[PDB]
């Protein structure tokens, strides 16, 4: 019954049928994006209208379309032709991943470049890389991918060990033409292999690890109903999945006594970008919007038991559209389980004689995706005590280059002749807040140091201050770790038993934000990434911090455009957009396959409850 | 055989015997501190000399002594009388915890104060609190404790719910006299109970938690030999225990191929302080050095299985001295176990077809201590990938006060009339570094942003810089989260296969440091807490950032005095002292017993290894 249920194979087939019937999905059409839309505000009272949004590409060169369909009613709600030079190109298509290599393989300029390096064309892999927006006037309105080459010595070889530096090509993937081949000079192609399953490199595998067995003999403590509605230790939510964003959480709420209290209406990673900090012309255009350009959900891994997810696991298998509108299941693409999380609360009291210990747990909802060389795990955690946390786990194989003779200020050395350009991985979490309902506001809270003097004669006092963010023009904020800066989302009309507005406090990691010069193309295209926290007034068309069409799209859309409306956010339906990232100077330990590193944020209750919410957790 | 083995009951009895024989431990003597000393540098070549350091108090008012004993040889090495007005009072004795309440109960000023508030003296608990150093000239050279009162309605009641504000007393615990009773006026004693095992407050306990069973059917992957030598997944270390510092790690090293490579010679929490930020004269003197004044090891809990520590647990039961020199065992005071830690590394490669997943694990060494109202867990983690981490878990019951009518800038409200003064918990980790041996140096590494222009025409480049800390005068450093500041400890004479010095990078949480005015007593006594990172040249008498005797001791010792020597630290035997803390504005959710909150730091290999050290971890 839930209008927040996952899309079914039947719904996708039905979208396909509706589009076909309407004349919108002929043989030259391809689906670049398809997803279910969330219910409108206040829609709970009226019957279901399941609506799907679709981006349709045309392989014959005609203009693409944005279409909204009502699958409930079997109708097209809207269909509009896109001018991509203005509003952006559609996301990269799965079917385009081979095309850059294939076209380049019979291009005389490319062949000449490979022959100069004594490389067999049959062994040269070409990564199909997003192009961005730079100085090349001919690319405006054209679907371009750029290609960087990596040598694969044999079918099972890791090509990332053998980058071909000094060479890049640009390709029109619709007209199937090579627009440019740039060769700045030969660099040695690094020779050592990076085959992390080769016994010669691993050596003898360890025999020292004894098994760890995690079981739940009575099954898990959470229930799943309606396909994707979770109930666990007072928490209530729906687990969505979108081909762009991946796992999306809806209707996060906590049952406090008899009342189901909303906390967050929708939580997602709405963008993620990987900007590279190497000024070589071979890579200086490199910025991968894994979410906006590639669609991270589309590449979600099938997760194997006792392996990717350990313990008593409940899986969801979300369905997405292929390029023709046929449903494709991602088998075991979402893991759900609960985990022990050490001590929750503990006190041994001298005066009462009472010794008390309770254990913590968390509910985990995750998926893992692969974007070329990168693999990322996206983890959402709900804790017994009301805390909500997100963690990203970055692994895979680092993107490589040559390591210049005489070193580099922008590239680290991994192996002889092998470099790894510096880069960042920067995420935007979009948290459509609903603290005890939709009437919310945000305050920035700083620690306040106090001067020794009257009222503070021993110079020990310290305090804090809160500044309400009243309008969008005032709500673009930066971190200040030194002053312990956090942001509190509260409901000014809902008070706890102490007559204080209920709230949740966002605790950031205060990692560096986007490092690029403010006048760069990337600082404009990923403007969201330049500041730690943005707050907007909710609008149904304000979905991504980079806008709907990121591929080859200049600035003009996204968060800077939204906040220009300067809307009231003081006791209104608001959305918090938190930027957080990893700055990666690759280390030798990252090669040939990288150990996981992490980043994230959390939100903790701040006078939301009337006392600890975990007093009813039982012993042992 | 190991000179790093835990102290045995026999060794403590033997220290007692040696002291007795030497005339140093008559009936009026009490042991305030006793611990084994680490072996001298280069001592491995000569036979064992187990030496113990002892602080001896005299209950009849004579001067205390610092004594070093050789238990191996049965001799007193040194014994010196202390002038406590100069060098500090000895740590608070367990036997003094009752004395403040007992003396106050027959004092007419105290009795008058309680009668003004209609409080039955038999129900008034008095916390025995460290005094610090303020304006009271008569306290210099005297052992003083201060007392704050809390009402206990019945034997099992949580007295913390019922603070008696407006009242404080000072007591000489040797002469057994009450020096001052200060009554600034009556405040309502908060009435609601805080009994977190009372069904009236908890409500019906949850029946929704299904069991989680963590077992190791073949036993653990670590070995323990010589009582406390651990070997686990290439790591090697010895687990020490000291009554002051608690768990101390010695000789942390990693077996890389055939070579045992040192990383850290000694790791401990060498101090921890809890400064309070309430300017009321009732509490403005409050700063608890839990380590230096109270001795956190002494109060380590006995940890119950399936409860405090879950899984296949190996315990150590360290032995300490009681006040008379008799050995006392802390049964199951140290937990050791390995834990699954999610995904270690993962890649699904498009070109090779190879899908690869490996799981991570960590070795955990922990203890939990109780200091009055506070309970703290101290956790050390070793990970497969070479990472070393510390985490402190803070829980217990918050220290309370009245909540003033009309609010407070320095106290939060928890319940009707019940306040919690703002405070911090600030730790100092002392890391005697040995990166590939003792010849080490520290660099501060910052991210470097670059301007769009020649050499960087697209404005995408970013870099980093490292500054070697060459002498102690230059090695007192602050955090800079915005620039991604870290500190690298390297060995300039030990290079990896890429001709780079091997190293480890310290990643701080960049939480606020000590907030008190720089001219306060606490800023001087806890000077270490005002800066994030200090580096000293190793010296055997430079053990604690606050010096040997913290109780009622002004500035003059500790880190500021050590670094004045301005010694060479550029390729020398050095020690890193990292300050990290929690700033706590108590929330309603913290009452009546606080959910765990955490702080810590970690160190990750940085070109220490020649490639990933976990390529030999087996599948599944
Ligand atoms: Cu990276
Ligand atoms: Cu605290
Ligand atoms: Na909202
Ligand atoms: Na050292």
From Swiss-Prot, chains A, B:
Pfam families the record matches: AGAO-like_N2, Cu_amine_oxid
| Induction cue | By phenethylamine.
The catalytic residues are 290 (proton acceptor), 374 (schiff-base intermediate with substrate)
Point out residues bearing the modification 2',4',5'-topaquinone.
Answer: 374
Q: Where does substrate bind?
A: 288-299, 371-376
> Which reactions are catalysed by this chain?
a primary methyl amine + O2 + H2O = an aldehyde + H2O2 + NH4(+); 2-phenylethylamine + O2 + H2O = 2-phenylacetaldehyde + H2O2 + NH4(+)
Q: Could you tell me what this protein does?
A: Catalyzes the oxidative deamination of phenylethylamine to phenylacetaldehyde with the concomitant production of hydrogen peroxide and ammonia.
Q: Which PANTHER family match?
A: COPPER AMINE OXIDASE, COPPER AMINE OXIDASE 1-RELATED
- Its recorded name reads Phenylethylamine oxidase
UniProt organism field: Arthrobacter globiformis
């Amino acid at each position: 019954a839930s209008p927040f249920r996952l899309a079914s194979a039947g719904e996708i087939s039905e979208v396909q049928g509706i589009l076909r019937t309407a004349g919108l999905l002929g043989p030259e059409k391809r689906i670049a994006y398809l997803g279910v839309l969330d219910p409108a505000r206040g829609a709970g009272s009226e019957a279901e209208d399941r609506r799907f949004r679709v981006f349709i590409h045309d392989v014959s060169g005609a203009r693409p379309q944005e279409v909204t369909v009502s699958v409930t009613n079997g109708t097209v709600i809207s269909a509009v032709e896109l001018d991509t030079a203005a509003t952006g190109e559609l996301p990269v298509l799965e079917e385009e991943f081979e095309v850059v290599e294939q076209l380049l393989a019979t291009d005389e300029r490319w062949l000449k470049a490979l022959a100069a390096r004594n490389l067999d064309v049959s062994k040269v892999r070409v990564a199909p890389l997003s192009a961005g927006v730079f100085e090349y006037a001919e690319e405006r309105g054209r679907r371009i991918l750029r290609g960087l080459a990596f040598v694969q010595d044999f079918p099972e070889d890791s090509a990332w060990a053998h980058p071909v530096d000094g060479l890049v090509a640009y390709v029109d993937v619709v007209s199937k033409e090579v627009t440019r081949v740039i060769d700045t000079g030969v660099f040695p192609v690094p020779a050592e292999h990076g085959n992390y399953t080769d016994p010669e490199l691993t050596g003898p595998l360890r025999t020292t690890q004894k098994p760890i067995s995690i079981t739940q003999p009575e099954g898990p403590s959470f229930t799943v109903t309606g396909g994707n509605h979770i109930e666990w230790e007072k928490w209530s939510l729906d687990v969505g999945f979108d081909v762009r964003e991946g796992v999306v959480l809806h209707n996060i709420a906590f049952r406090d006594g008899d009342r189901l209290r909303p906390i967050i209406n929708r939580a997602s990673i709405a963008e993620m970008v990987v900007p590279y900090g190497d000024p070589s012309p071979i890579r200086s255009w490199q910025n991968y919007f894994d979410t906006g350009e590639y669609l991270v959900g589309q590449y979600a891994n099938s997760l194997e038991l006792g392996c990717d997810c350990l313990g008593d696991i409940t899986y969801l298998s979300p369905v997405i559209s292929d390029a023709f509108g046929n449903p494709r299941e991602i088998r075991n693409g979402i893991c759900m389980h609960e985990e022990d999380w050490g001590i929750l609360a503990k006190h041994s009291d001298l005066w009462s004689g009472i010794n008390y210990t309770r254990r913590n747990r968390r509910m985990v909802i995750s998926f893992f995706t692969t974007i070329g060389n990168y693999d990322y795990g996206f983890y959402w955690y709900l804790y017994l005590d009301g805390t909500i946390e997100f963690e990203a786990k970055a692994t895979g194989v680092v993107f490589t280059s040559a390591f210049p003779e005489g070193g580099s200020d922008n590239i680290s050395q991994l192996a002889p002749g092998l470099g790894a350009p510096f880069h960042q991985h920067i995420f935007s979490a979009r948290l459509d807040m609903a603290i005890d309902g939709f009437t919310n506001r945000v305050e920035e809270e700083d620690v306040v140091r106090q001067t020794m003097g009257p009222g503070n004669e021993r110079g020990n006092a310290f305090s804090r201050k809160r500044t309400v963010l009243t309008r969008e023009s005032e709500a673009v904020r930066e971190a200040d770790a030194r002053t312990g800066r956090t942001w509190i989302i509260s409901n000014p009309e809902s008070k706890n038993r102490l007559n204080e507005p209920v709230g949740y406090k966002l605790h950031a990691h205060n990692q560096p934000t986007l490092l690029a010069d403010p006048g760069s193309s990337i600082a404009r295209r990923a403007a969201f990434a330049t500041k730690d926290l943005w707050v907007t007034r909710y609008a149904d068309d304000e979905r991504y911090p980079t806008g709907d069409f990121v591929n080859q799209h200049s600035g003009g859309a996204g968060l800077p455009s939204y906040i220009a409306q300067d809307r009231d956010i003081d006791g209104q339906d608001i959305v918090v957009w938190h930027t957080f990232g990893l700055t990666h100077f690759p280390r030798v330990e990252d090669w040939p396959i990288m150990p996981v590193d992490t980043v994230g944020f959390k939100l903790r209750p701040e006078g939301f409850f009337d006392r600890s919410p975990v007093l009813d957790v039982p012993a042992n």
